[PDB]
CSV table of C-alpha atoms in Angstrom, one decimal:
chain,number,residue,atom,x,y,z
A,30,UNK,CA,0.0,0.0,0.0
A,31,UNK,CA,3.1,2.2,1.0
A,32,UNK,CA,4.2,1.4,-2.8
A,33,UNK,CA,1.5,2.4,-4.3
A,34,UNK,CA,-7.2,4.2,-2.8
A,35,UNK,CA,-8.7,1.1,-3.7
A,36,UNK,CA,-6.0,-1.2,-2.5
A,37,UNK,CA,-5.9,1.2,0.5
A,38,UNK,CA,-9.6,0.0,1.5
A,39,UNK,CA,-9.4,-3.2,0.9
A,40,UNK,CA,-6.5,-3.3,3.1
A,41,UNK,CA,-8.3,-1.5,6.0
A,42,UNK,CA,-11.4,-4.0,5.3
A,43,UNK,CA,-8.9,-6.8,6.2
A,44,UNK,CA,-7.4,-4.9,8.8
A,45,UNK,CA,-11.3,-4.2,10.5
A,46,UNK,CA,-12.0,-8.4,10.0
A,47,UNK,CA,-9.1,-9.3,12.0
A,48,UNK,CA,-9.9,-7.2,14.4
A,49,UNK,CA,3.5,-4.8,17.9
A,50,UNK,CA,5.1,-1.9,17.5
A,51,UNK,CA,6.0,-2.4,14.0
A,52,UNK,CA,2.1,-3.0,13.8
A,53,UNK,CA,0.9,0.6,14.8
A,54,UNK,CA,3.6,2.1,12.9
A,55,UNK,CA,2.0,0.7,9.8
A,56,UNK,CA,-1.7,1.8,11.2
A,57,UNK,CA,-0.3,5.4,11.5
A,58,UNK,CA,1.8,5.2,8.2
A,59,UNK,CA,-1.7,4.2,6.5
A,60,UNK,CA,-3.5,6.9,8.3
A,61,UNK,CA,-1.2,9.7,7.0
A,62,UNK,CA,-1.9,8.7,3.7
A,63,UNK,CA,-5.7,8.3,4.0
A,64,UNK,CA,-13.0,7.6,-5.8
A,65,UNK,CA,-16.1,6.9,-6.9
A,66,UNK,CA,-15.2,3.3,-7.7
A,67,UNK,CA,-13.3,3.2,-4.4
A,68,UNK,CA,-17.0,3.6,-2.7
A,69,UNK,CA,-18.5,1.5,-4.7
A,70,UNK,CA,-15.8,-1.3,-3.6
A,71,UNK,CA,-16.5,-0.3,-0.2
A,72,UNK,CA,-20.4,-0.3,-0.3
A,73,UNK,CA,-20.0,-4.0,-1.6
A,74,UNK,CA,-17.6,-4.8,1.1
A,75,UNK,CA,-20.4,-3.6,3.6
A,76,UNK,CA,-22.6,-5.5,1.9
A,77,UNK,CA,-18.4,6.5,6.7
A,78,UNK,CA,-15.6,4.2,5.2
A,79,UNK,CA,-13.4,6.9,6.6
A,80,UNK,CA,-14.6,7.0,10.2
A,81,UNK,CA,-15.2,3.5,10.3
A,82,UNK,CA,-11.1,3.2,9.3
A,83,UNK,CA,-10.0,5.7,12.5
A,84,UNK,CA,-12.7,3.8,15.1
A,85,UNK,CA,-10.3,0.4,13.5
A,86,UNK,CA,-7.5,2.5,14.2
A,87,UNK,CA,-8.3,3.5,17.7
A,88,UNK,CA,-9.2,0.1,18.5
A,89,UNK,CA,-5.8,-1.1,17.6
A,90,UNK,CA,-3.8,1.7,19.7
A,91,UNK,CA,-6.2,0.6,22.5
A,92,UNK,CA,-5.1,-3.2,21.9
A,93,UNK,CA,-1.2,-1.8,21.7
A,94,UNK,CA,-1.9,-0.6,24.9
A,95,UNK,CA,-2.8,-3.2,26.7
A,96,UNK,CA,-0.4,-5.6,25.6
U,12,UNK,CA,-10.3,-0.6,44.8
U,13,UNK,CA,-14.2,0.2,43.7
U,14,UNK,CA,-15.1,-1.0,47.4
U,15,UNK,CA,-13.1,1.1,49.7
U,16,UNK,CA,-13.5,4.1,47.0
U,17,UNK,CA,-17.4,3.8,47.4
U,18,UNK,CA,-7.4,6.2,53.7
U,19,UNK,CA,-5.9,7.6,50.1
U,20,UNK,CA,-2.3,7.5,50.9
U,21,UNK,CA,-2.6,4.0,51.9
U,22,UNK,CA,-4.1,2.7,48.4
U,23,UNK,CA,-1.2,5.0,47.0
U,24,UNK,CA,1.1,2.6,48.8
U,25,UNK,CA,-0.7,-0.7,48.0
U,26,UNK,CA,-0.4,0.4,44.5
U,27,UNK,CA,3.0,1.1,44.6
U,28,UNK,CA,3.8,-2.5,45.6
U,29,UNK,CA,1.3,-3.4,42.9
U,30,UNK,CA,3.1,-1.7,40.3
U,31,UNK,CA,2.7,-6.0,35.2
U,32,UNK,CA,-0.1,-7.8,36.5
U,33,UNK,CA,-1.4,-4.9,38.2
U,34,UNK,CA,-1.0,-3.3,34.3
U,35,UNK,CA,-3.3,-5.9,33.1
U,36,UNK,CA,-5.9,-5.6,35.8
U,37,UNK,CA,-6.2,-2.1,35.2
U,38,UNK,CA,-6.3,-2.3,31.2
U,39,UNK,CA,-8.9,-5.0,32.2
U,40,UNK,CA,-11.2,-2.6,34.2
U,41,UNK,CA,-10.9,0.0,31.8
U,42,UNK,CA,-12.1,-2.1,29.0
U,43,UNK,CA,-14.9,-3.2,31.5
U,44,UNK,CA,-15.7,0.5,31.8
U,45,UNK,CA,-15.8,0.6,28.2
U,46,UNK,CA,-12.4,10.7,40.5
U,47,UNK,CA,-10.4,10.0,43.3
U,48,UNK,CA,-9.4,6.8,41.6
U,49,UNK,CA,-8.6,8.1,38.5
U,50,UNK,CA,-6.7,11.1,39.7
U,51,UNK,CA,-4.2,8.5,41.9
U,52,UNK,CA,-4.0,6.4,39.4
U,53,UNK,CA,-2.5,9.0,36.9
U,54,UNK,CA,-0.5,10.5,39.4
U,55,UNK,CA,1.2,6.7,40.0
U,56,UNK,CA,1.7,6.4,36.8
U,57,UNK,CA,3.3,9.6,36.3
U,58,UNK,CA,5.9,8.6,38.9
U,59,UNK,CA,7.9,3.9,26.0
U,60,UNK,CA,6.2,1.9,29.1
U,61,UNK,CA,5.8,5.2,31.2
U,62,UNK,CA,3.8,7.1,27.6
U,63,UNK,CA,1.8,3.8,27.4
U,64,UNK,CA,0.6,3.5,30.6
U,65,UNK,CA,-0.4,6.8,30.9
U,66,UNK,CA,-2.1,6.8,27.5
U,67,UNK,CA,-4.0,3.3,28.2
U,68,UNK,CA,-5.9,5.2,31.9
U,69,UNK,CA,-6.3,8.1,30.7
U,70,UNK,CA,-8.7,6.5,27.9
U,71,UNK,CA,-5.7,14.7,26.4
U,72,UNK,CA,-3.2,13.5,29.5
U,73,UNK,CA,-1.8,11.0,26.2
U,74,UNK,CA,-1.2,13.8,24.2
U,75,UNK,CA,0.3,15.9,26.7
U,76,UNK,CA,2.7,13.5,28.2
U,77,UNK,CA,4.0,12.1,24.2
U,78,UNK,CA,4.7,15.9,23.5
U,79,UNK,CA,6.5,16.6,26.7
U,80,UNK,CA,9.0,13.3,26.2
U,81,UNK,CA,9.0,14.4,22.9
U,82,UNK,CA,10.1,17.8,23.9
U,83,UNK,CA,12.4,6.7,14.5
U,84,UNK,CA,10.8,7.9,18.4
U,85,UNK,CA,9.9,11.4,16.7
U,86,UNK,CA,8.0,9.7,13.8
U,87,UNK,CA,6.2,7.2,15.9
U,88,UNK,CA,5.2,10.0,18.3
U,89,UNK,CA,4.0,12.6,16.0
U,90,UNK,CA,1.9,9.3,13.8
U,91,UNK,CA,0.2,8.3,17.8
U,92,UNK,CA,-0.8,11.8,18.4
U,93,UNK,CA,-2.4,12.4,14.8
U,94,UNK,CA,-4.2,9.0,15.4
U,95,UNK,CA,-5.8,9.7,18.8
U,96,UNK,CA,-6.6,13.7,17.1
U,97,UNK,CA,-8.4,11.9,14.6
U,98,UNK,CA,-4.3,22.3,14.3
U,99,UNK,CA,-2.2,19.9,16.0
U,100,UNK,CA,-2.2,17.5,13.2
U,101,UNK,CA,-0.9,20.4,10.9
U,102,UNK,CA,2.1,21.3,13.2
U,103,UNK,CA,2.8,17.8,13.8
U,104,UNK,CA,2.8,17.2,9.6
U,105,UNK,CA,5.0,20.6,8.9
U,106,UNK,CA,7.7,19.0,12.1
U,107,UNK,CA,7.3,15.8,10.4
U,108,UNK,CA,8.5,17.7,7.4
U,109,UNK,CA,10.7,19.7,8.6
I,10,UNK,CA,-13.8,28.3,24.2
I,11,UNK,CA,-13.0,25.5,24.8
I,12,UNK,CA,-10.3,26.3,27.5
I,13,UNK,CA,-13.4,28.1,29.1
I,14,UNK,CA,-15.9,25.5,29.1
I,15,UNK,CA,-13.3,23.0,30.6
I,16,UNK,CA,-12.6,25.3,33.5
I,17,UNK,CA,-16.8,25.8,34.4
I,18,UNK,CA,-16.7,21.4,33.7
I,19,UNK,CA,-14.1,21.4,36.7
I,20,UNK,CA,-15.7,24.0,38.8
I,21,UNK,CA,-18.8,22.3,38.4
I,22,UNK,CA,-17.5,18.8,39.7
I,23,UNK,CA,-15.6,20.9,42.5
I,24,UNK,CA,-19.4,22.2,43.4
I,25,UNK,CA,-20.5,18.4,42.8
I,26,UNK,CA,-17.8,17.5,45.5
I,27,UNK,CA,-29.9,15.4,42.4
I,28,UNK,CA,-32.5,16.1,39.6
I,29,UNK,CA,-31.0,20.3,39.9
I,30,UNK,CA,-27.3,18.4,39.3
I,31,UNK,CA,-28.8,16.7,36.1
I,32,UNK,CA,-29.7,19.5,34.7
I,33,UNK,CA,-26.8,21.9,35.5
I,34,UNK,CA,-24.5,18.9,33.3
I,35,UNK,CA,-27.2,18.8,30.7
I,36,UNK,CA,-10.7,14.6,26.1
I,37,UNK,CA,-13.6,16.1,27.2
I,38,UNK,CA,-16.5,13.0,25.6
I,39,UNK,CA,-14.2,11.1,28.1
I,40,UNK,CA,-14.4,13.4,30.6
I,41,UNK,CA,-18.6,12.9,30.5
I,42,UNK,CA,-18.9,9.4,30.0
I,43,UNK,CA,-16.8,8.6,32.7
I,44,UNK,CA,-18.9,11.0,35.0
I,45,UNK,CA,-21.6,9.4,33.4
């Protein structure tokens, strides 16, 4: 993804259904880089992205955390 | 801990000899959550690990204690705050930058 | 603003410190739930 929007979401769409160090650096590396088509792939994954993506992120900080 | 808070400087001891389980039982009652307690627990902690800890309870005291240590670490940092923001992720951006 | 409304939020719970308390509460989304 670093390489490289609609790669991007399916990314965070894997990231979400899985839901150390090196781990959130990647989370936070993604969320500085975060279009029509890339809603329409993320519609169909439903089947908002943007928010959806920080409350993933959050959750993994909060996991990161803890451990 | 919830039954004698429904003797402070006593808990503050207890605490003491409490402090990595005692880590986990906290991140476990916070994520059951999910005053006077809260405001001995932060000042223990304030007594890497030490940012953590802080950040983990206190779930604006995050922020505030990352920018004060900060005051590959530097990237990390500045990436955690713009994370929990989401001004400040401007600044952090232009130092990032810069 | 927001400084401001921060400091009358701690003031308040330093009053605190039941229906008339609702209504004078009716980082800082934290700050609620956990008084909450």
């Amino acid at each position: 993804l670093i390489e490289f929007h609609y790669l991007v979401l399916l990314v965070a769409k894997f990231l979400y259904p899985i839901f150390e160090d090196s781990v959130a650096t990647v989370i936070e590396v993604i969320e500085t880089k975060w279009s029509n088509l890339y809603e329409t792939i993320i519609e169909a994954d439903k089947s908002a992205t943007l928010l959806k993506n920080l409350r993933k992120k959050l959750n993994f900080k909060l996991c990161q955390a803890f451990m | 801990r919830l039954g004698h808070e429904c003797r402070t400087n006593f808990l503050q001891l207890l605490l003491q000899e409490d402090i990595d389980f005692f880590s986990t039982l906290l991140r476990l009652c916070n994520a059951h959550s999910d005053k006077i307690v809260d405001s001995i627990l932060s000042q223990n902690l304030r007594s890497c690990f030490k940012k953590l800890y802080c950040f983990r309870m206190l779930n604006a005291a995050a922020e505030v204690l990352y920018q004060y240590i900060l005051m590959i670490r530097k990237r990390k940092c500045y990436l955690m705050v713009i994370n929990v923001l989401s001004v400040t992720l401007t600044d952090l951006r232009d130092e990032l930058r810069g | 603003c927001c400084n401001v409304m921060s400091q009358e939020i701690v003031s308040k719970i330093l009053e605190k410190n039941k229906a008339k308390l609702l209504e004078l509460p009716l980082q800082d989304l934290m700050k609620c739930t956990y008084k909450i």
